[PDB]
């Protein structure tokens, strides 16, 4: 009974997708298939710095008058960038649907990058990075990406190295903007109280101008020993299958089974036919090795012996979590934008439920043995990590005798 | 060959099983071979 996500396509290739619902406020966003994976180490912070510059004024709406408009209807304006996708989204009321779309049009095209602003946003970005190091789990996941995807564009961070940040100019940005903002790589996603025909007419009216035009898992480890920190963060991952491979669903159930360290989180990060599947835990130094041992046993267990009931637990757990319908509009659309960018279609919740209920214990331990057993992991540690075991002990813990 | 790894090495027990079988046969070959090599080496100087 969940309403279907209807997708149309303009000549530009900008797929305009929408999923109407009763809620009177909507989350209209633009997703773009452009991240740090498409950068070539000479423009490693171009997407991040453009994400900073995108709300500082356009040609038609110069400066803060633009954001005055998004204050005037009381709407909320957000943007984010990952290694593969960039999103500019607005939460607003339903009746303010046209102007919001027009605002989004300016943000993707006709944007203006002021040289004055460029220096101010450089100091913002530089400073944030200079303090970003504070967030350990971000440092550990960046280290894990770097040591797992050495020599590839997937190792480099979204923010880029301070070097590039300082060394960036309007023209470079202009390039990234004019290169990675093509209309066939763009989805206009709407969730909530929107009509699809009105949204399609608004996309035809504005946004109809947008121009129309592998990775290797290096199993290895990076350890940043700094003994003055109170807690240690350790992430261990193996290679993931990718977006389009259905056993992801089964792997998600495996994560739902795992769900000794103060904090233990499992992740299945997916990129275009690659990814990182693993666990991140933050612990006191004198516990670290025991955690690792614990964690490896669980994984090995699933690969070795997994019952029927726990599987059911994961199935159900995932089900409720996977549930996103009417979770929130922002989430809803976020899902429409990512589904049109990655799968090329919006997978409905009934298909997700079918793929969940076809998962049993035998295929779960088969897929877990395919992806976890006797695999070389990527290890990233930060903090008092002397008792964190080196690569032979972790690699030997990746199988059982 | 992946087959070897997939079939003989993947399962630790098989890894042992193959080693076990190999050991059972290695002796035969090595013994006989070395014996003959030795025999040839000292082809004429022996009890015979």
């Amino acid at each position: 009974s969940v309403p279907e996500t209807q997708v149309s396509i303009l000549d530009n290739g900008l797929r305009v997708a929408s999923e109407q619902s009763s809620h009177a406020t909507c989350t209209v966003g633009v997703w773009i298939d452009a991240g740090s994976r498409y950068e070539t180490e000479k423009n490693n912070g171009a997407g991040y710095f453009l994400e900073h510059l995108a709300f500082k004024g356009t040609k038609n709406r110069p400066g803060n008058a633009l954001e005055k408009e998004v204050e005037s209807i009381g709407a909320h304006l957000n943007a984010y960038s990952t290694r593969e996708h960039t999103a500019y989204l607005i939460k607003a009321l339903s009746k303010d649907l046209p102007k919001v779309v027009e605002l989004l049009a300016d943000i993707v095209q006709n944007s203006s990058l002021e040289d004055s602003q460029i220096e101010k946003e450089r100091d913002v970005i530089l400073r944030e990075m200079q303090e970003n190091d504070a967030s350990m789990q971000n440092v550990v996941f960046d280290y894990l990406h770097a040591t797992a995807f050495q020599g590839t564009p997937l190792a480099q961070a979204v923010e880029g190295p301070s070097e590039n940040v300082r060394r960036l100019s309007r023209t470079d940005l202009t390039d990234y903007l004019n290169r990675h903002y093509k209309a066939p790589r763009m989805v206009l996603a709407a969730a909530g109280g929107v009509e699809h025909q009105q949204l399609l007419d608004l996309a035809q009216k504005h946004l109809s101008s947008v121009s129309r035009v592998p990775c290797r898992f290096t199993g290895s480890e990076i350890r940043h020993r700094d003994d003055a920190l109170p807690l240690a963060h350790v992430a261990i991952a193996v290679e993931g299958p990718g977006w389009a491979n259905p056993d992801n669903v089964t792997l998600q159930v495996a994560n739902a089974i795992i769900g000794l360290c103060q904090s233990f989180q499992t992740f299945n990060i997916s990129y275009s036919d690659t990814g990182l599947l693993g666990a991140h835990f933050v612990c006191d130094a004198m516990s670290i090795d025991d955690m690792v041992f614990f964690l490896q046993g669980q994984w090995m267990r699933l690969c070795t012996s997994a019952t029927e009931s726990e599987v059911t637990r994961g199935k159900n757990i995932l089900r409720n979590a996977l549930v996103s319908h009417l979770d929130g509009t922002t989430p809803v659309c976020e899902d429409i934008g990512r589904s049109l960018l990655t799968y090329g279609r919006r997978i409905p919740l009934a298909e997700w439920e079918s793929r969940i209920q076809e998962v049993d214990a035998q295929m779960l331990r088969d897929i877990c043995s395919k992806y976890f057993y006797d695999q070389c992991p990527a290890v990233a540690g930060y903090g008092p990590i002397e008792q964190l075991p080196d690569y032979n002990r972790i690699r030997s813990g990746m199988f059982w005798l | 060959p992946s087959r070897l790894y997939s079939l003989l090495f993947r399962r630790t027990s098989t890894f042992a099983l193959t080693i076990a079988v190999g050991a059972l046969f290695f002796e035969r070959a090595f013994d006989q071979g070395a014996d003959a090599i030795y025999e040839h080496i000292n082809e004429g100087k022996l009890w015979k």
Binding site: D133, A146, G151, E159 | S2, S6
Partner: peptide
């Protein structure tokens, strides 16, 4: 910060990838 540098080039050491995973 962390982003300042990239994993040093181990290519010299790196050998000449699941297709090769079992092989290796």
């Amino acid at each position: 910060s962390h982003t300042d540098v990239k994993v040093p080039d181990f290519s010299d050491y790196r050998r000449a990838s699941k297709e090769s995973s079992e092989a290796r």
